[PDB]
Symmetry: D3
Subunit: 216 residues, 6 copies
């Protein structure tokens, strides 16, 4: 009688590393261990080229490396929809897009998989529209996997919009530190350092043959 859930992670995956992959396994173990849910699929959805940030490499590369990272996974996949659109899409739209897609196979609920960082982001003074925060939290749900869940709970308590919808945010503890951020990987790469065993062997091979992140 459990609820069927799909896990959706947006982001830049620039590049993807073991840490993003671990977040999925963590979150599914947790959800399924509530006794209240059954996790049915996960989806990585990298941001597109319209988001014009510096250091952000062409989507097609970031899509590959994510596909390499998940080739053997029974349950997590990459969807290129958002990377394809000609104008940049807001997470709330990416979410609606993926929920409507499931309803069209004639019902599993999508939920946004994030870290605390999202919560921090949500409270930066003018940055988000309260009503957009409300729709995400309230219509979908958050699964916040983090090594600082103690910070996580505090942001929830400090925001009325989050507190109001708290029964729909799940804070998940990571007891095994593995803080392998894209930013550190890129930093290591432009210094010529090894990144072996922080990202999947094939993702490391792709980065090396294409000399990515080596430059600046």
């Amino acid at each position: 009688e459990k609820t069927e859930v799909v896990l959706l992670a947006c982001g830049s995956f620039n590049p993807i590393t073991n840490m993003h992959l671990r977040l999925f396994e963590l979150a599914k173990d947790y959800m399924n261990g509530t006794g209240r849910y059954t996790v049915v699929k996960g989806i990585i959805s990298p941001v597109g080229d319209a988001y014009k940030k510096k250091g952000l490499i062409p989507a097609y590369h970031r899509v590959i490396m994510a596909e390499l990272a998940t080739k053997n996974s029974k349950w997590v996949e990459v969807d290129t929809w958002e990377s394809l659109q000609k104008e940049w899409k807001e997470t709330l739209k990416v979410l609606r897009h993926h929920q409507e897609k499931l309803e069209a196979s004639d019902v599993p609920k999508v939920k946004l998989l994030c870290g605390a960082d999202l919560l921090e982001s949500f409270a930066v003074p003018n940055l988000w529209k309260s009503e957009d925060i409300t729709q995400i939290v309230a219509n979908y749900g958050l699964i916040c996997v983090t090594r600082a869940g103690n910070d996580a709970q505090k942001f929830i308590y400090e925001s009325d919009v989050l507190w109001k919808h708290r029964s729909n945010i799940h804070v998940v503890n990571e007891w095994f530190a593995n803080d392998i951020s894209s930013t550190k990987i890129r930093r290591a790469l432009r210094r010529g350092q090894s990144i072996r065993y922080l990202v999947p062997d094939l993702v490391q091979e792709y980065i090396e043959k294409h000399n990515l992140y080596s430059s600046e």
Copy 2:
């Protein structure tokens, strides 16, 4: 016995309009009317895709429209060098690049063609390195065409680096107002307005068939 000069205009040309084209004819008429120079070629050099700004469309489009804009001109051309490089290039490098290229045909002096806007830019507190300003002004020269030359002269008087090298900056008056900025063209385009007779007929046709700048 006059000095041979080449006119180099960097920028985004996003898109090019009658105003940029007029700047060249203005500046050559002036230079050649000093009695001290003979203008020998001009060069438009659009910025590349590494400069990641919002609203800045792919170089290849901006290169086309500039080539359409100058197809009939006896003396002005487009060079795609800077648009091609994989990392963004500073104007001082674009300049050295084009001077060295002339020296390799076995001597004409390149000079940077700009408006006041450049001068304004040069004095923004932390924005430019004094030594880079010095090399441009001093090693190459500026030709500042503007409708406000009165502002132009003032920025020169207010900056030691510019004043020092003033004998190498030529302020050129435009007595015929034709302030057709890219920014206004894009604004008009995303409101569905005509831009006929502010840009060359062929540049207007290209923009229309490709639906550029229509979106946001």
Copy 3:
């Protein structure tokens, strides 16, 4: 066959002066001289005590002085609704409130009467929600009476949201300067100066007997 319009002016009226009264007569003359409208009533609606600004005196005073200011007017009145509510109300709600009230007398269109100041305000970086600006302009309309309509038109041209809905904003010129701002009246009053013949005789009498704005 003309359209019936109601003129609604929100604000603090702190206090009301001849200038606010003149804005109504100006705007009606204009509207009625389009040949396209007939102005049917005007409404002054002072802000409430929830808006807690400094220098803003209790609503009941500001309501009186407005009622004194309009006692003899055939067509302009004061509605205390917004001043009465326990929580501060946004202009878009005040607007909906007054439109729905007319529809309940079984159809005249309300329009917001403002000056340029509103337009300036609309473009301050984070200050307004684009969608709220859109509803006001688009669902109601603006009548902008000003001595600087030249600035007015420019703000319209500079904002996509305003430009989009321009056919619904009427910029009205005042050829008779009478810039009697509340701020100047209060300033004069706390210096003990006369304000006779800048506000209606009765409003001046009320302010004097209650020693308002004399203090700080």
Copy 4:
């Protein structure tokens, strides 16, 4: 031969909670245990309605709840003087007001009862006039009750004005954490949570029957 002292606490009491009440008992125990003083009365004096802050409810409510909070206390009382004045009063004036009042009963010294927060406040760059800080500290005295007295002592050491007059500031440790801030109470209340046993039963009853702080 001990000195007779009166304890004066200014503030918003919005609302009062067990924490403010505890500060008095703490400070008297301390003073009286110096062997150098005898505490003779305390006074809560809520700020007035001229201070126009958001969330700050009408004085009369805040005066009640403080009177309910102290009805059974042998030694602490509420004085409504400052709440009554038509213009907002600075603490230094409230202080002079209360000292002169004692001198008029034909001599006990008033002292300002505060937390560290005051000290933090005193050093914010432009916020206080050095000479006002000097008069308070020097003419009256501070009794700083806090759970962080370690921060307290540091602010004293970091400010010349405070250090100079240190012999007149008493830092009091609270070994029993009871951080029940008004801000947290209001937050709890607008989420419908219990605040029972963080404020006196009667203060809780008043807040509930008047539905205070429930709104926003």
Copy 5:
């Protein structure tokens, strides 16, 4: 029966130029032409070395050049008092110092001679203490000589403290533009330009023999 006045100009005189000298003759002509005063002496008082600004050269130089500038004047002199003190002195103290000195010759009123610049300065948000502005204006008086008296009057109207004491501020028009600022002189000097006939011949000679302001 006229009032006897002394004119005191503080500042950096870095260096002094014809413009400062002209301000005195202007202000005396004006005062004496009121029919209400008789100007009896003027005093230039350069700031000291404690004021540690960049570009500000040692007092002794600035004292010389002022003494050279006034050697032939029947009525204006230099007083080195403020330049001598070991700690920097505020204008209000310099003023009290010079008034008390006159009272000691057994009564002429000192008045501060300034330009608009002072008025501008007086209103910069946190910059001056209202009470210091009050003492200067009110206890001494201002004589504001300027080419923009129209700006002058406006600052007076915009500040309550100034407006209150307006009967004690005299705005003096200069109908002969001679804007020879220290800043422009120094700028000219470090570019090797002539400053002949903008400062007294002897001041120009001193600057030249000591190579002042030539450097940076």
Copy 6:
């Protein structure tokens, strides 16, 4: 076969204290205990009077107190060169100055002796020119003695310019806390407190007889 090194410490020495003296002995012990170097001389070089900071007393005083502080040291000395120059000198020039001086005695390498504070400083957004940081680190070397070497290593890891040249930065731990900053000494002095046994007896005597830092 070890490398011969000279230790150069720039700064204000305002005043010098036991802490600066300890930094030298610390750094030499460390260098010499690498087995790779031999420390041959150290040099304190106080900043000059052109650097016009507030609280910074005349160089000649700061030069004395440093000479008193080192009179008995076999190996550390004061060089007044930089204090003497008429324009303020950048550390990179002070460095080149001292290296060239050694090369002129017909080869020991100078190295900059600093604390973390330098590293913090190096990363403040616009503060240093990357190329100047590069020349110091790369052409000379840093010896960073600190009680927080853990912060030290982190700044190194966070800056590409530092990381690139890390093999040339030596982070030295101080296991004996002795944080006697100039700022604390001056603070103590203007409160009339003892500073005995935080600075050399003779430096303390000089400060006392000249009443330095007593004022403000």
